[PDB]
Structure to design on (970 residues):
């Protein structure tokens, strides 16, 4: 083909192979220049499926499951391949048109891998292919001699014919030779308005290559013709022969014997005698008889097709029949029996849609039965069948019976291809599991309740489905690293129990949606997304094009750095992991309960894999590399619960939504979008590392450390959102331990916090923020909300945070030992000392801003708790409550400094409480003096308690309701 040098070559390559943006059904594909300018759009119909075209050189196109279409001057080729190339179909009659440069070759077998294309509804009608209303667009592809043309018509040859495929658009076509031939100036490769978005001209070797058109009357793509010639290299135009409808009609029809009808009236069965050496046979239901022809010597063309019909036919074979290229077609249900061990072979069987054929006739060693049509073939022979099976459409039920030696075998191998068919196993004796392979676009193997063991999964791609569709659960035991491209579906468990000390990864870039459990023991498991397969060339062709300044040419189907990946989704009841390394890479979603024992689990693992043979068939070449999702759309997702036990490690680097139940393990979070639900950690550190951002959205209980280094942990609510559906939660750690300047511990309203808080560096701890409870609260939700005593936040622990900024609103802080803070902000918060009396407790801060807040210090008349402020104290309307732990007497005196602050601080920033805490029934009296470089508030007397209609005094500071505290301040 010849293309213009303005568009990137890879477009034409990908277009021809239905890859990348050119997958079948892709719509509105926009096309751009090398200089990035818009040239046009593929918007007249969805991208067509080119898979009826032969995959290696595109000189022939399947127009019937048994006939290709090409030009007769293509006299050499003797076979073609479809899809991924892993097949071979041989010509048995070139079927040349005698006046037209055109042929319609009959093949040896029925093709299973692909559907044939539809052909023009019109055929050789003069002028038809100029009506843009009916046919808006024409596409072609071929592998002729490949050039690029510049502006000034100069030609550079990139390769010979039959090296690779190129495809593109073609302009509307005029007819000549009475409508038998059509043509267009397709060589005008820079004229987009005339020739479409990707103009291409056919060259030597593009002979026979197809032309397709979108037919808006039928709303579908249609093969119109096949390419015959052009005006030489870089020439002005091409000619095509229009598919000749009367001719291909004659070619099909002449292969059919007269149509065989069963009537029950004529009696017993149709008896099928076949004389080997003449290659002839008959089908006799006692009186009536039916001609049948088969193979003759090495001549497969001597066979003719049979078409069987009539209600509930029945046919018995007396002789082994060798049908050659004759095929069978069942338009009605039939059963085909044999007591002689008569075999049958031929081109294939077609079972019409809604038809079932019980087939009890074995094959023959080294042959392959081909099955197609959308109906069902029930295979019920007796004994070992040594034949093979290639299925391509509808259903095949394997129900082979045992012989008198008890041996059974439906087939020696089974190949499932095209995406249309299903193979059903009645039991586990029909086939050796390792001999089942899935070709181009796959199909389903339905294990139908039987549990099985596979040492391999020979699967070309994502259309390969292993499944179980009945409610008798079944297990698939695997036992080969290893790559599976396919899908696992339905009522299954899957066991991947490796023997000890192995380090081979089982890799899945396909998908899974199963109702049971997936078990890995030892090794690696990697579930991941799958980069889009693209066309590629050799390194020499990519260099030649780089030489000419086009860098678009690829040298492998998939790579680690490409932007286009397919999303994959994995769903199991349970993912059980023992002694494994488990990874969920980019472009994958996992929905499971993970049950891990001595395993690592990396959610958002950057180690992922490509298959160097991806798209070339069932052979694969794994390579491991690095690919990190940077865009939310490509990021792994995990939903569910992670149970960790016995030295397990969980690394959260992806979009995570789950509860954690952990014992004797570790969790490390570096993801900036993790949401932890209800969690319990026992001997399990929880590390949030740099850049991480996590929400504990429900209760969180650990007996251990929660380490926040330059990360952000929010409990109950985030500090960039106000919620009106909060529930009261627990939040317990052995310790909350921040480090680094950027660390943040945000504790939302209705969190009951417990555990010491330790801050290294200038991190920030914030207790309280906006948010309202849900109107709908369980009883436990009510019983817990009650324990808050009118406060939004309760914390019990001690604060070691000398350079930190700490902030508390509407909080009740029970401080259990000496505490330090760099910068403290209190707003309507009550702080109660609750360390020793052995010596009392100190709170030391550098800077305290305090507003409508209170401190409750305890005394024994000799000593007390103490607030120390070193550098600045600001705010207003704070109260010192004194819990006199001994009833003071006026025959005895008081001199205890309770708050000390810079000398310049206002006097009334602190005032004595108006109310009592404790048993003493007295209020404090507080005097200001300056002393050893700081203003002091001194407990130097007491006062008989005023009864201000509040009821009894709070017994300790824990009994100071918020309403008590707040109305005292006011
Ligand atoms: Ca013929």
């Amino acid at each position: 083909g010849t293309v213009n040098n303005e568009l990137g070559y890879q477009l034409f390559r990908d277009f021809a192979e239905n890859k990348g943006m050119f997958r079948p059904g892709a719509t509105n594909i926009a096309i751009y220049n090398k200089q990035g300018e818009f040239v046009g759009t593929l918007d007249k119909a969805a991208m067509p499926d080119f898979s009826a075209v032969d995959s290696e050189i595109g000189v022939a196109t399947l127009i019937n499951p048994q006939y290709i279409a090409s030009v007769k001057h293509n006299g050499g080729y003797t076979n073609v391949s479809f899809g991924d190339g892993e097949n071979r179909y041989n010509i048995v009659d070139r079927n040349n048109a005698p006046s037209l440069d055109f042929h319609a070759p009959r093949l040896d077998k029925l093709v299973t891998e692909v559907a044939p294309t539809a052909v023009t509804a019109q055929g050789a009608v003069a002028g038809a292919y100029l009506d843009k209303e009916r046919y808006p667009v024409f596409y072609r592809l071929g592998s002729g001699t490949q050039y690029i043309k510049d502006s000034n018509g100069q030609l550079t040859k990139m390769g010979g014919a039959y090296s690779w495929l190129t495809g593109g658009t073609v302009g509307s076509l005029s007819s000549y030779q009475n409508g038998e031939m059509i043509s267009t100036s397709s060589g005008l490769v820079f004229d987009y308005k005339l020739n479409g978005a990707m103009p291409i001209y056919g060259e030597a070797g593009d002979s026979g290559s197809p032309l397709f058109a979108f037919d808006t009357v039928q709303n579908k793509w249609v093969l119109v013709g096949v390419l015959t010639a052009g005006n030489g290299a870089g020439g002005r135009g091409n000619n095509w022969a229009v598919i000749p409808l009367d001719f291909i009609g004659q070619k099909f029809n002449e292969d059919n014997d007269a149509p065989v009808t069963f009537r029950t009236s004529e009696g017993g069965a149709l008896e099928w005698s076949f004389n080997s050496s003449t290659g002839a046979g008959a089908l006799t239901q006692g009186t009536t008889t039916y001609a049948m022809h088969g193979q003759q010597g090495n001549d497969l063309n001597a066979g003719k097709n049979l078409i069987f019909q009539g209600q509930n036919g029945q046919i018995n074979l007396k002789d082994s029949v060798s049908q050659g290229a004759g095929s069978l077609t069942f338009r009605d249900n039939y059963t085909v029996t044999t007591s002689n061990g008569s075999t049958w072979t031929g081109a294939g069987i077609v079972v019409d849609n809604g038809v079932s054929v019980n087939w009890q006739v074995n094959g023959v060693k080294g042959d392959n039965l081909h099955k197609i049509g959308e109906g069902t073939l029930t295979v019920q022979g007796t004994g070992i069948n040594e034949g093979g099976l290639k299925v391509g459409d509808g259903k095949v039920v394997l129900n082979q019976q045992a012989d008198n030696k008890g041996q059974v075998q439906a087939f020696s191998s089974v190949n499932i291809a095209s995406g249309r068919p299903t193979v059903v196993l009645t039991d586990e004796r029909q086939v050796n599991p390792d001999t089942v392979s899935w070709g181009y676009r796959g199909g389903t193997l339905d294990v139908n309740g039987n549990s099985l063991t596979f040492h391999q999964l020979k699967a070309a791609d994502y259309g390969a489905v292993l499944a179980n569709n009945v409610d008798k659960r079944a297990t698939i035991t695997l036992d080969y690293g290893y790559l599976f491209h396919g899908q696992l579906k339905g009522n299954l468990n899957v066991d991947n129990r490796l023997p000890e000390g192995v380090t081979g990864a089982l890799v899945m870039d396909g998908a899974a949606d199963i109702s049971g459990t997936f078990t890995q023991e030892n090794g690696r498991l990697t579930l991941q997304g799958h980069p889009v397969i693209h066309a590629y060339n050799t390194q020499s062709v990519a260099d030649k094009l780089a030489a000419s300044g086009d860098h678009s040419v690829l040298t492998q189907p998939t790579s680690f750095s490409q932007e286009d990946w397919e999303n994959r989704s994995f769903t199991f009841d349970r993912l059980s992991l023992k002694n494994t390394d488990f990874g969920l890479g980019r472009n994958a979603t996992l929905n499971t309960t993970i049950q891990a024992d001595n395993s690592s689990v990396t959610l958002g693992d950057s180690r992922v894999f490509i298959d160097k043979n991806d798209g070339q068939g069932t052979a694969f070449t794994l390579e491991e590399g690095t690919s990190v999702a940077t865009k939310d759309a490509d990021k792994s997702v995990f939903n569910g619960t992670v149970n960790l036990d016995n030295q397990s490690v969980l690394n959260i680097n992806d979009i995570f939504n789950g509860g954690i139940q952990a014992n004797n393990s570790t969790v490390n979070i570096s993801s900036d979008s993790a949401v932890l639900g209800n969690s319990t950690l026992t001997s399990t550190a929880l590390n949030l590392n740099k850049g991480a951002n996590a929400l504990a959205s429900q209760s969180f209980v650990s007996d251990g450390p929660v380490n926040i280094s330059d990360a952000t942990l929010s409990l109950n609510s985030r500090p960039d959102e106000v919620s009106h559906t909060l529930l009261p939660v627990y939040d317990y750690a052995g310790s909350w331990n921040l480090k680094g300047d950027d660390a943040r511990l945000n504790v939302g309203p209705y969190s009951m916090l417990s555990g010491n808080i330790n801050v290294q560096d200038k991190g920030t701890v914030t207790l309280g923020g906006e948010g309202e409870l849900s109107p709908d609260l369980t009883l436990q939700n009510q019983m817990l909300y009650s324990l808050f005593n009118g406060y939004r936040n309760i914390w019990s622990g001690s604060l070691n945070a000398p350079d930190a900024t700490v902030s508390m609103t509407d909080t009740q802080w029970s401080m259990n030992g000496n505490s330090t803070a760099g910068n403290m902000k209190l707003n309507r918060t009550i702080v109660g000392f609750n360390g020793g009396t052995s010596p009392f407790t100190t709170l030391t801060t550098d800077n305290l801003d305090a507003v409508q807040s209170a401190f409750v210090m305890r005394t024994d008349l000799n000593k007390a708790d103490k607030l120390v402020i070193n550098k600045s104290a600001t705010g207003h309307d704070n109260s010192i409550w004194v819990n006199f732990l001994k009833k003071p007497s006026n025959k005895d005196t008081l001199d205890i400094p309770l708050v000390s602050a810079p000398e310049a601080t206002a006097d009334n920033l602190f005032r004595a409480s108006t109310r009592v805490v404790g048993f003493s029934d007295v209020t404090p009296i507080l005097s200001v003096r300056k002393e050893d470089g700081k203003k002091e508030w001194v407990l130097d007397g007491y006062q008989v308690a005023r009864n201000d209609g509040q009821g009894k005094a709070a017994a300790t500071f824990m009994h100071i309701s918020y309403n008590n505290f707040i109305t005292e301040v006011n």
